[PDB]
DNA sequence: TTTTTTT
DNA sequence: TTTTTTT
């Protein structure tokens, strides 16, 4: 149990202060690859590195990824604004990998709802790379008032049917003022071998955003990390849910 | 005919006071395997054991398993709070097995609605392990009022279209604030060797929850105990229903 | 034209007083098979036996089977209460068979609406045995008032949107307090043999309740009796209706 | 232009007074075949007979068949009530045949809307014989008021949402109090052999009621008479209509 | 740019005053063929005859056919009322033919929207002759008020959901009170002659009314004149249209 | 970042002032092919030409094609009004081509939203050439007020439910007063020959207007330039969008 | 034109 | 569980 404020700081300290077995501040060397000719938009954090330095925090990103990842991103944000005088940089993703507990798609249960889980499996499908509105800026066509609504890649589009200012039910989505990011859906299912004779390989759908889009093709063995999310089955008539994996970090493996 | 209040107490006694042919308070030994390293969340109760000690009660769990099981669980809850000083432990399932009457899928009818029955048979289907919302929490996006509605794994999702506080018809389900449990659907049919001549084997769909989830695969001979539950089919304006078996306990058998 | 009150009595007398060609009070020997080890829940009345004793009543079960059947059941109810002192016995079905007019599925018309008819044919389909709510006991969740509404196996479910006592539009169906019976749909059509060359058969769908459920399988030649019923052609937006045969008695025949 | 009152009388006179080339009052001989063992429910009037006796009326059943037919039916009702002392007989249909103008399906046009037309053709389909509510008797479940609303076999069911007496919006259809008649749909089209090259065979759907139900099977050459009716195309989005032929009389012909 | 009033007169004059190369007032000779034993309901106007007499008006029927045709019909209405004392005659169609610009189906575009065009082509389809409601009459079933709404054969049906008098949302279309005319759809495409051997022949759908109904079959080489009309595509969401050719005159040609 | 005002001028200058390696004011020779017997309605601008002359502008048409294309068209407008005394000519399209970055259908992403991109691909489909309302003039039928609303070919039809003047909810589109243009949809996908044949090729739909309509058939290898546009997926219960390519120039290529 | 009474 | 961007 650690609140955001301190996490950011602890994360900041982790990044600049962590050193491996050679004195490599590797995370300084990764906050550096953020500012080159071909810049990256995310920082790959090895969980074991975070654990050894501060396991008390490493057991928060797992038990509370929405705050943990978010906080760590504010941390990268700071160690740039301070240690490199860069504020111009867009948003950078905190992508944790190499977790302790490595589940199987069939094992994913309601226990893991909104917890960062790690999953091994094989990709069976990959969708088209489609634009996702990460921030929908609505505009009023009566007074011209602007309304900001952040969206979530697994939740449905959250509109607004009434103006905040003049109360006019004449609101439209302004594509230009809005923020868009690449998005790609994909499915992975436990490899047939790991299972047992009479078992039906079980699959899970997942989401990829920004830089981790188009990183895998059907038939790749992968080890994804990510937040287990839940939603209603299409119809939305019963109290049973759909499991979606909001991927936080994906990494191939040749078995 | 026995109300809850007494059943709780009678169950309490049964648990701590029952002894087999060797003076084993077996249920004290099972209330024990609730507190260990690898804790279980349910007490397997042999019906014959209940019957021999208190057959008037044993004939209530069968005629009224909603009250019956529920009472027994409050019993286990008490014999922990008193005899072990533990109140931290979550909820523990009272799972009855080895009933006297053992039906065959085909003989399951309207007489058994909401009575605990016992069925032997062979699993033909098992669904994905889905999160079920045991207790749903709706949130208003106008006044932020909270409304709690418990759901039932066989009944359809019970929503609320209007705010209890401000009466705003702008309510949404909050996934975090809600409670979830593992859920799995499965089908079983009569063993063919027990049916006669030109009979075609009948089936029945069922539900597993929490600990009993993913305990059986397609092709297993099982003996399930359960509550026979009914609900209206693909419409909602016809007085015909659908038999669903809310399994209370499942146990394998190699014939 | 005979009212219920007198029918009950005339039926009572019929059962106890009727003798065949050997002085067999056959119906006394049948009301007897109701109280045995393996009890039956219906009394199979030959229409010819009723006609010969009282044809003025036998022409009432045909022209008014709702009253006719109902009255004859109160008669079996009384001849048990008086002649055998039994009042514990549940409800017994008066099922008439062997009528004079034996129709063919294609001949069934508007004329027969709500008259007891007799049909020969072949069974083409049989549905699953689902529970039918014969008596919906609605409960208010504001004042706890109880409302009883009998249902009809062909008609749509008749709910109630407002409380009879407090007028609260918060009513629900109570499964337990309600009475359920086994139900099974089935379809019979004309034998394409006695149906002109390269023509086509028009079938009928039928209903079975309680004891007569699961008595036939697809391919059986049967001779059913029953009430011809009618209901709005699926989507209730046209003046045309659908013929349903609420079966009152079914009997096989090997041709 | 002749009003109902007079039409009924002239029709009455026609029936009893008409004598062919042998002094046969044939229509007396057909009002006769109404009262026998195997009674018919319609009088088959040859238009040519009507025309020669009264051609000014025969040019009314064609230009205004809803009045014409109805009037002639009251006339048959009267020439039974006076000349045979029968009033018990139900309703009898005045079915006209053998008109001057014999149309081809493809020729039936807007001109003929609501005129009695004659059409030769080939039956391509016949529907099931369903019950039609010719008179929907609505019953109020608050005051028990009764409301009669006649229905038309091509128009949609006309209900009534409010009580005529107490104004309670709790009205239902009473199956028993209502009048039902046999109904059967069927389609006929010009036959491909009779067409002039590029043209592709056009069909028309029709309605049969009561006695004329189930008179034809698919593949019969027929010469129907009837009232050309119009309705919206299923969707009801465009000002273009569907041609339905309310049959008034049908007669086979072996070519 | 000429307003209606003047056109009517200019047309009136044209009809009675025009003479060819032999002094034939041909149009008088055609307004004549209107009154005969076998009357026609349309006057075929050659555009070249209209052009030579008054080319400033001829260039109005093309640029504004809706006014042009309509004015010319009022003209024919007048030169009957005055010059022949006939007012009983119904409505006569002003059908122009032989225009200067003669398009090819593939050349028909947005330019031509609502301009009278001329198209040569080959008929590939013809629909059934259905009744169109040229003038629809709505009647209120609460106060009985009547509302007239003229329809257009290409646009969708224009209803009215609220009463003009009492404002009751209980309005229906009265078939009888309404006016219907014959209607027939048809398709033509470019005749696969003049059209480079590697083009996919483009086509267009058209509408015929009254007297010009059923004038061509599939496989006819025709020269149509017509108003190019558009309507919102499929969903009526999108700002896209559909080209329909409301024919104003059709004429065969044997190549 | 350059505002419209200046771009117009800079573009004006570019057109009249640019000279190749031969002193050819090529664009003067092209603004010339605008006035001739067979006039074109678009100026085809090589990006490279714009780039060498003014590379700070050429990196605006790409980064801001709405403003950029628009601007250049006002420039073409001016260099006609001044240098040729023509103001009668309609609207001329500025169509850039031969861009530096030439994407592949699968590569097109969120980054390119509203930027002019270049795409090589193979045409797989082409739609019918339907009229598009580029400017919808709405007319009120109560006061006669006119309201201009420009449309976009990919966005849905923007109507107006209320009159600007008298507030009458009785508004209709006036087809005449509106401006229309030919429209044609078409799909292109990467060629799977130049893409590991173990992948499923991905496509993109596009829009063609005016003069670029009907320039390609299915199977053509093309190099389109255009604006990448986004709209929601059919249903619209997702913050996930659909990519459409509003073509700004299309050119064939024989590989 | 509408395509089985219910699937 | 969902089944492709879509007629
Ligand atoms: Zn506003
Ligand atoms: Zn609220
Ligand atoms: Zn109440
Ligand atoms: Zn009433
Ligand atoms: Zn009214
Ligand atoms: Zn207005």
Numbering used by the authors:
A (entry chain C), B (entry chain D), C (entry chain E), D (entry chain F), E (entry chain A), F (entry chain B): 0 to 254
Authors' text:
Hexameric MCM rings act as the replicative DNA helicase, encircling the leading strand DNA template at the replication fork. Each Mcm subunit contains three domains. The N-terminal domain (MCMN) possesses an OB (oligonucleotide/oligosaccharide binding)-fold and usually a zinc-binding motif. The MCM complexes of several archaeal organisms consist of six identical subunits and have provided powerful models to investigate the atomic details of MCM structure.
The structure is similar to those of MtMCMN and SsoMCMN with three subdomains: a largely helical subdomain A; a Zn-binding subdomain B; and an OB-fold subdomain C. The central pore of the PfMCMN hexameric ring is oval-shaped with a variable diameter around the ring reflecting a significant deviation from pure sixfold symmetry. The RMSD of the C-subdomain Cα-positions from the sixfold permutation is 3.03 Å and 1.45 Å for hexamers 1 and 2, respectively. The ssDNA circles the interior of the PfMCMN ring in a plane perpendicular to the central channel. When viewed from the C-terminal side of the complex, the 5′ to 3′ direction of the bound ssDNA proceeds clockwise around the channel. The structure reveals that the individual MCM subunits do not all simultaneously participate in ssDNA binding. The subunits that interact with DNA use a consistent binding mode with four nucleotides per subunit. DNA-binding is consistently observed at the first subunit if this distance is less than 7.5 Å, and it is not observed if this distance exceeds 8.4 Å. The most significant interactions between PfMCMN and ssDNA involve two adjacent arginines, R124 and R186, that project from the β-barrel of the OB-fold towards the ring interior. The DNA-binding consists predominantly of interactions with the sugars and bases rather than the backbone phosphates.
